[PDB]
Write a protein that holds these residues in place. Structure first.
Motif, PDB file in Angstrom:
ATOM      1  N   UNK A  75     -56.105 -59.479  -1.595  1.00 53.75           N
ATOM      2  CA  UNK A  75     -55.134 -59.470  -0.500  1.00 53.75           C
ATOM      3  C   UNK A  75     -55.103 -60.814   0.222  1.00 53.75           C
ATOM      4  N   UNK A  76     -56.279 -61.408   0.419  1.00 52.22           N
ATOM      5  CA  UNK A  76     -56.378 -62.726   1.048  1.00 52.22           C
ATOM      6  C   UNK A  76     -55.697 -63.774   0.173  1.00 52.22           C
ATOM      7  N   UNK A  77     -55.939 -63.683  -1.131  1.00 46.32           N
ATOM      8  CA  UNK A  77     -55.347 -64.597  -2.102  1.00 46.32           C
ATOM      9  C   UNK A  77     -53.822 -64.537  -2.073  1.00 46.32           C
ATOM     10  N   UNK A  78     -53.286 -63.361  -1.758  1.00 46.40           N
ATOM     11  CA  UNK A  78     -51.843 -63.152  -1.754  1.00 46.40           C
ATOM     12  C   UNK A  78     -51.265 -62.948  -0.360  1.00 46.40           C
ATOM     13  N   UNK A  79     -51.954 -63.464   0.647  1.00 45.87           N
ATOM     14  CA  UNK A  79     -51.587 -63.196   2.036  1.00 45.87           C
ATOM     15  C   UNK A  79     -50.182 -63.708   2.407  1.00 45.87           C
ATOM     16  N   UNK A  80     -49.727 -64.774   1.748  1.00 43.98           N
ATOM     17  CA  UNK A  80     -48.403 -65.352   2.029  1.00 43.98           C
ATOM     18  C   UNK A  80     -47.223 -64.568   1.442  1.00 43.98           C
ATOM     19  N   UNK A  81     -47.509 -63.832   0.372  1.00 46.58           N
ATOM     20  CA  UNK A  81     -46.520 -63.049  -0.354  1.00 46.58           C
ATOM     21  C   UNK A  81     -47.219 -61.867  -1.007  1.00 46.58           C
ATOM     22  N   UNK A  82     -47.483 -60.828  -0.228  1.00 43.24           N
ATOM     23  CA  UNK A  82     -48.187 -59.658  -0.734  1.00 43.24           C
ATOM     24  C   UNK A  82     -47.432 -58.937  -1.848  1.00 43.24           C
ATOM     25  N   UNK A  83     -46.113 -58.863  -1.715  1.00 45.83           N
ATOM     26  CA  UNK A  83     -45.291 -58.105  -2.652  1.00 45.83           C
ATOM     27  C   UNK A  83     -45.834 -58.311  -4.068  1.00 45.83           C
ATOM     28  N   UNK A  84     -46.502 -59.447  -4.281  1.00 43.47           N
ATOM     29  CA  UNK A  84     -47.162 -59.726  -5.552  1.00 43.47           C
ATOM     30  C   UNK A  84     -48.253 -58.703  -5.858  1.00 43.47           C
ATOM     31  N   UNK A  85     -48.820 -58.109  -4.812  1.00 41.91           N
ATOM     32  CA  UNK A  85     -49.891 -57.117  -4.973  1.00 41.91           C
ATOM     33  C   UNK A  85     -49.368 -55.699  -4.771  1.00 41.91           C
ATOM     34  N   UNK A  86     -48.077 -55.558  -4.471  1.00 40.79           N
ATOM     35  CA  UNK A  86     -47.517 -54.259  -4.100  1.00 40.79           C
ATOM     36  C   UNK A  86     -47.791 -53.157  -5.112  1.00 40.79           C
TER      37      UNK A  86
END
Ligand code: HEM
Length: 149
Positions: A75-86
């Motif tokens: 989540x930290x790694x993708x904090x700028x664009x979470x939708x990547x982790x959605x």
């Protein structure tokens, strides 16, 4: 998650990420101190833990902590664009389903995460830092909720 909050989250996570189990151990110790009724949800080899300290003796449970910390790290790694982790987060919500439990205690797990961060960061746990983490945690729980429903 906007830019300013994002560097705050990254910076504060660096410390944590150096020793994820030691940190997650705090999170879960705090969790079971706040809500010991969550302790029976974690059962391994057909056994219930009697006390919170029992959970810390279980390699399966400690391995569970490492998984939790790796997901927060993602989540930290993708904090700028979470939708990547959605999609992953919705699949994680599905997993909780499920194995057996709702996410009605989400705020308590959240306060345990924030507790661990507060204790690790000390004076560096600024108001801005707490707010950023609260919003990140909220965003993660929402995606998991979409999972579950
Ligand atoms: C809302 C309150 C929550 C409760 C009561 C809860 C409880 C549980 C339980 C009982 C398990 C299964 C343990 C096992 O059998 O090994 C589990 C798995 C897991 N949880 Fe939580 N959880 C909560 C929220 C969260 C949150 C907010 C995150 C991350 C941001 C998270 C990340 C994980 C991960 C990564 C697993 C392992 C999933 C897998 O094996 O694929 N959980 N949780």
């Amino acid at each position: 998650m906007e830019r300013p909050e994002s560097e705050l989250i990254r910076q504060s996570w660096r410390v944590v990420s150096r020793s994820p189990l030691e940190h997650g151990t705090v999170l879960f110790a705090r969790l079971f101190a706040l809500e010991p009724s969550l302790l029976p949800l974690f059962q391994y080899n057909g056994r219930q833990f009697s006390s919170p300290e029992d959970s810390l003796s279980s390699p399966e449970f400690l391995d569970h902590i490492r998984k939790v910390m790796l997901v927060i790290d993602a989540a930290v790694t993708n904090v700028e664009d979470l939708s990547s982790l959605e999609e992953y987060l919705t699949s994680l919500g599905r997993k909780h389903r499920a194995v057996g439990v709702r996410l009605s205690s989400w705020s308590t797990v959240g306060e345990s995460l924030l507790y661990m961060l507060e204790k690790s960061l000390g004076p560096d746990f600024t108001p801005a830092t707490r707010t950023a983490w609260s919003r990140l945690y909220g965003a993660v729980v929402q995606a998991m909720s979409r999972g579950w429903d």
